[PDB]
Design a protein around this ligand. Sequence first.
Ligand SMILES: [Cu+2]
Ligand SMILES: [Cu+2]
Ligand SMILES: [Cu+2]
Ligand SMILES: [Cu+2]
Ligand SMILES: [Cu+2]
Ligand SMILES: [Cu+2]
Ligand SMILES: [Cu+2]
Ligand SMILES: [Cu+2]
Ligand SMILES: [Cu+2]
Lengths: 275, 275, 275
Amino acid sequence: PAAADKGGDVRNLTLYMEKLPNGEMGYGLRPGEATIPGPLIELTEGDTMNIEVVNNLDVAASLHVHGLDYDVASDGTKMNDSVVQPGERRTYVWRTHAPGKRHDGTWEAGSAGYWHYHDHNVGTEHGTGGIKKGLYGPVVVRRKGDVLPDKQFTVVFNDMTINNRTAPNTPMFKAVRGERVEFIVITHGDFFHTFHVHGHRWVDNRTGILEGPQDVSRVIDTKTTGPADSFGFQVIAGERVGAGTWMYHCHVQSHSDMGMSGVFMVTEADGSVPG
Amino acid sequence: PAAADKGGDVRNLTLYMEKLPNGEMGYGLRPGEATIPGPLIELTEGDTMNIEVVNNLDVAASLHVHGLDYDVASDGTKMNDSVVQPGERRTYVWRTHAPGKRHDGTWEAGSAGYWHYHDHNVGTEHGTGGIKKGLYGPVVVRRKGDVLPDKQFTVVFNDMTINNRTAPNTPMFKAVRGERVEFIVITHGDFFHTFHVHGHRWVDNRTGILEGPQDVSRVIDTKTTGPADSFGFQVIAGERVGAGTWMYHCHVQSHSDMGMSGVFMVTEADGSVPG
Amino acid sequence: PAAADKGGDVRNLTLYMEKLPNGEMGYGLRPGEATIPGPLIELTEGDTMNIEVVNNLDVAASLHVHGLDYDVASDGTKMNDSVVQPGERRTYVWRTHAPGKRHDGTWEAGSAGYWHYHDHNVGTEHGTGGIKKGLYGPVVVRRKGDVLPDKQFTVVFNDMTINNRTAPNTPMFKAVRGERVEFIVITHGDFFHTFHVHGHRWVDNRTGILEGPQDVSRVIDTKTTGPADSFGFQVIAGERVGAGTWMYHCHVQSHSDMGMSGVFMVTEADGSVPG
Ligand SMILES: [Cu+2]
Ligand SMILES: [Cu+2]
Ligand SMILES: [Cu+2]
Ligand SMILES: [Cu+2]
Ligand SMILES: [Cu+2]
Ligand SMILES: [Cu+2]
Ligand SMILES: [Cu+2]
Ligand SMILES: [Cu+2]
Ligand SMILES: [Cu+2]
């Protein structure tokens, strides 16, 4: 299995905050290529990201990240003077660290995990407006040695939507049976959800993956998730269960009845799927 | 104490889906013996369950399970043609597995845990009407060597009820001080709850029991649980606290004031209780 | 840093239940010195607390505790005849224990953790009115050898407030960069929240501190919390991120927009802060 090498690179990135059709807003890697969710930023403990943010919106907006090391200047809040005016640009710096023992003999936990970034200034000083309209994206921080996936899918429960869509227009994630698949699950907005995926399960720990025989973590297939929670996991697609149309949905009954569901399509190597 | 043996047996079961008084629906081991919750199904990692489901309801209904290994033909969904017409029957198959190393050296987590089954077709294609009316039940999968209880009690928070009842008609669970009692807690429907039991506590891990001196798990007596969450634990009834009428309830205040509570009655050997 | 000694001491405390301005109620260490939250109670596994409760309210009221060992006489409920009439007093006893093996070879988990106490009789038999008006407070139980903090901050999400207040009147917690600070987070009432603090993160286990290399727990900066949930953690203030005005808030967007936020102000040694 492919595994993450040691971290420690300084990386540069540019994000464009752009208007999208029908009043939505998105981050993109190039102008006119903004998506909801925004691009996935992946790094390894020790890496630094210098992210230039270009605001092509009509109102001041920002970039706030969960979990990583940043100083108040990269807070993403008006309060700490960390927002971007229309037509301007600003650099936000994200640092990360490996686990280590402090001089006092206590353990500092590393940066690795499933995280996210989003706007903190549109609509309100908590970014309620920007989050609603699509300004959110995933961040994966690896630890050295972490197993890497073949595919990555991001599910954002944004109020009563999946990635701002409802069924049947929610994303379908396709993989081949046996592929290692990574899910990143983020919740935003005003409501609490339960993420459930048919035919698959994962370990309720940092990686979603059993670490070894002394791992006492619950194995689950449903997880409560509320605004700005983030978690992730990896499955072998179709393991023990075969190819097929596997629903992923919020299991709150009114929510799934109102369209908070989508398809995880696990196919055979030739692309066929039962049904 | 009694501990679960090595699994790997093929077991057969028949469930009947039956109308109950006042528009309710339950699963039963025999016609006319349907209960809410349905019968507890217990197996050990490696065991296979072949479950014949007889539908004596007036609408098509199904059986969907969390956590266990099943193919799309036992998905319990109309989408994968996995439902039972009124007056017909259909066999669903649940497989389970123990933990193990894959070829690529990674670890597959075992099936063991606190799980559940429910309808996925009555009312809506997510089972909203069937779940509402009582079509749900607990599943327990053991790992070999897991400690076994003397009693098992199932608590389902279904919307604003416990097992479709409200106080004072919610179930009283009875045990003698010192007995090993196992609780299985499932939530269904539209709302989020906090399960709490007076005078007792457990470990927030797979078994609810401390695995050993290495186990870093939180020790809790309250837990958030949302639609289709399932967990469970064992306590020694009355340990360190004595016999008594020990409340269990949802700790959301409006919910407890509206009848979401019941009694865990821990008696002396002679059946007496303080008060 | 400082580490907790072994427990096994018997401690005595008096709490006064007192009317507060504008219809609020609080627990206090002296008459006229009640606070919301009530005073923090800290002990070590094996310690016993004898708490004399003086009810100076106009209605019968009580003391109910999570997590610790108590018999039904200290249950705090009317049903177990465990309340205090106006103008009277009553002693509640809390015991605790260390982990250990029972005779049957199973592990009994210890009492250590982040816990809380509240009224269980004012307004309703579940203390709904007493909890609403301010009758709650934190409890910290240590394990022998636990790292001890320099400061303790208690955040109680009580319905749509923090310690019964909204911004700008929510508590400001101050510490110097490098100081070891402890947060205790408790939710009460009718709603679910997600606690988030900018610039800081912790380990989702008993202590909030990484135990060592084998600790598989999710490292997080956001956590769902519902009524009577309690957790806690320690951080090194400003670690990797510097001094600053670091927001803590519920991340439910309407809740934060409606005042569920406050300031964690990390200063330099001389009291200065950026901004
Ligand atoms: Cu914020
Ligand atoms: Cu939902
Ligand atoms: Cu955020
Ligand atoms: Cu489903
Ligand atoms: Cu509830
Ligand atoms: Cu389900
Ligand atoms: Cu209670
Ligand atoms: Cu909130
Ligand atoms: Cu309580």
